[PDB]
Each structure stands twice: as structure tokens, then as C-alpha cells.
A paper describes a structure:
Here, we focus on Spy0129, an accessory sortase responsible for assembly of the covalent polymeric shaft of the pili expressed by Streptococcus pyogenes (group A streptococcus; GAS) serotype M1. Spy0129 is the only pilus-specific sortase of GAS M1, having been shown by gene knockout to be essential for the polymerization of Spy0128. In this process, Spy0129 cleaves between Thr and Gly of the sortase-recognition motif EVPTG of Spy0128, and links the Thr carboxylate via an isopeptide bond to the ε-amino group of Lys161 of the next major pilin subunit. The overall structure of Spy0129 conforms to the archetypal sortase fold, in which a highly-twisted, 8-stranded β-sheet folds over to generate a core β-barrel, whose surface is decorated with loops and helices.
The Spy0129 structure solved in this study comprises the complete 237-residue polypeptide, with the exception of the first 35 residues, which constitute the transmembrane anchor and were omitted from the construct (Spy012936–237) to permit soluble expression. Spy0129 was crystallized in the space group I4122, with two molecules in the asymmetric unit. Crystals could only be obtained in the presence of 0.2 M Zn2+ and the asymmetric unit was found to contain 19 bound Zn2+ ions, which were used to derive initial phases by single wavelength anomalous diffraction (SAD) methods. The structure was subsequently refined at 2.3 Å resolution (R = 20.4%, Rfree = 26.0%; see Table 1 for full details). The most distinctive features of the Spy0129 structure, however, are the three long connecting loops β2/β3 (residues 86–105), β4/β5 (residues 126–150) and β6/β7 (residues 173–214), which between them shape the presumed substrate-binding region. Distinct differences are seen in the active sites of the two independent Spy0129 molecules in the crystal. Alternative positions of these loops are stabilised by bound zinc ions that coordinate the active site residues in different ways in the two molecules, and by crystal packing. Structural superpositions, however, show that in molecule B of Spy0129 the conformations of β4 and the β4/β5 loop match the equivalent structures of all other sortases, and that His126 superimposes on the catalytic histidine in each case. In this molecule, His126 is directed towards Cys221, with a bound zinc ion bridging between Cys221 Sγ and His126 Nδ1, whereas His127 projects into solution. We conclude that the bound Zn2+ ions in the crystal structure are probably not of functional importance, although they do play a role in stabilising alternate conformations of several loops and in stabilising the crystal packing.
Author numbering: 52 to 237
The structure:
């Protein structure tokens, strides 16, 4: 719970930079950003060694969620431990029922994200694991790339100023499989 832990985590590890909540799941966690994307494989939010590691914002993103595309990722262990419910978004009824997640930043800014796709892709997706590549792609290539890999999708109003947030980890039942749940910042 955020009220007991967030400030203290923030005080303990300057890598701590947001809190993530996804209604309909037990995803309700502090988020770190590392200096690279391997740092939190075997490191906890408190900054110590860990067998499961942590969920992390891509090192190339702005902590303020100002970028076009903010990628929140978990490696294999942390994904199984913390993001085990993401594949529920593959289910029609689940996807139609749970439509948002929210983030609170370290300056206590509150963001609401509107979910529009659940994606099945793999570790070698040419677009979605690089926020820089996304930033320099057109909105239409981004949305069509996503569309063709989506198991669930919904059309929502977008502008060219729209920002996106993706949550992702592995899906160990398919080859090099990755799941992505993506939304648009309210
Ligand atoms: Cl990857
Ligand atoms: Cl874009
Ligand atoms: Zn940093
Ligand atoms: Zn539910
Ligand atoms: Zn660090
Ligand atoms: Zn990994
Ligand atoms: Zn895995
Ligand atoms: Zn607060
Ligand atoms: Zn593509
Ligand atoms: Zn709205």
C-alpha cells in the first residue's frame, strides 16, 4: 500500500520514481528507474540484492511520463512475481471490464491511463521495446504496428500530442514471447 511505503522508498533509493496501480489486479507497486535496463534483474526497490528483482521504467524515459511512450518492464522473475496477471487482458470480458491504470509520480502528480490494447509479440519486436524508436515513428505506424499484434483492441480518441504507457514482461508459454498492455494518458 502506497501510504505506508512510497515516501519511505523514495527516501531510501533515489531510483524510486513512481507508484503504479492497476485496478482488477494486485498490481499496486512502487516503480524504479535504473541507469540501464539490466540493473533491476536481481535488485529490490530498496536497492539490495534480490532473487526476484523489480519492475522498472525504461532507463531512456523521462520520470515525469512526458515522453510519447513510457515503457514499464519486468524481467522474467519480477514479471512472474509481480506482473503475473497481465495475461488476463487477453480475455475479452476482462479487457472490457478493466480499462484504466494509474500512476503517481515522485512529485505526486497523478496520471490516469486509458487502456486500449493487449499485445502478443516477442523479445524481438522491432518497435515496442525502444521508446526512442517509438518517438521518431509516425502515429499511424505505431498504431498499426500495435493493431496487428493485438489480442484485444479498442479505438479511442487520439491527438498527435497524446502520450502512451506500456506495461510489459515475458509470456513463457510462447517462443521468446512478450506481453504488452498499452494505454493512453488521460
Ligand atoms: Cl525485450
Ligand atoms: Cl507516436
Ligand atoms: Zn536515475
Ligand atoms: Zn475484475
Ligand atoms: Zn540505480
Ligand atoms: Zn531479462
Ligand atoms: Zn519468462
Ligand atoms: Zn500521494
Ligand atoms: Zn511494425
Ligand atoms: Zn477520459
Amino acid at each position: 500500500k502506497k501510504g505506508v511505503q512510497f515516501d519511505d522508498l523514495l527516501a531510501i533509493n533515489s531510483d524510486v520514481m513512481a507508484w503504479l496501480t492497476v485496478k482488477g489486479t494486485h498490481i499496486d507497486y512502487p516503480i524504479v528507474q535504473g541507469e540501464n535496463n539490466l540493473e533491476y534483474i536481481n535488485k529490490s526497490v530498496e536497492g539490495e540484492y534480490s532473487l526476484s528483482g523489480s519492475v522498472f521504467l525504461d532507463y531512456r524515459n523521462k520520470v515525469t511520463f512526458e515522453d510519447k511512450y513510457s515503457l514499464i518492464y519486468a524481467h522474467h522473475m519480477a514479471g512472474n512475481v509481480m506482473f503475473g496477471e497481465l495475461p488476463n487482458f487477453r480475455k475479452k470480458s476482462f479487457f472490457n471490464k478493466h480499462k484504466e491504470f494509474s500512476i503517481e509520480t515522485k512529485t505526486k502528480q497523478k496520471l490516469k491511463i486509458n487502456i486500449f490494447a493487449c499485445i502478443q509479440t516477442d523479445a524481438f519486436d522491432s518497435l515496442l521495446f525502444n521508446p526512442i524508436d517509438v518517438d521518431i515513428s509516425s502515429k499511424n505506424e505505431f498504431l498499426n504496428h500495435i493493431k496487428q499484434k493485438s489480442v484485444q483492441y479498442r479505438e479511442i480518441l487520439t491527438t498527435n500530442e497524446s502520450r502512451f504507457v506500456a506495461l510489459s514482461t515475458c509470456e513463457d508459454m510462447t517462443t521468446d514471447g512478450r506481453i504488452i498492455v498499452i494505454g493512453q494518458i488521460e
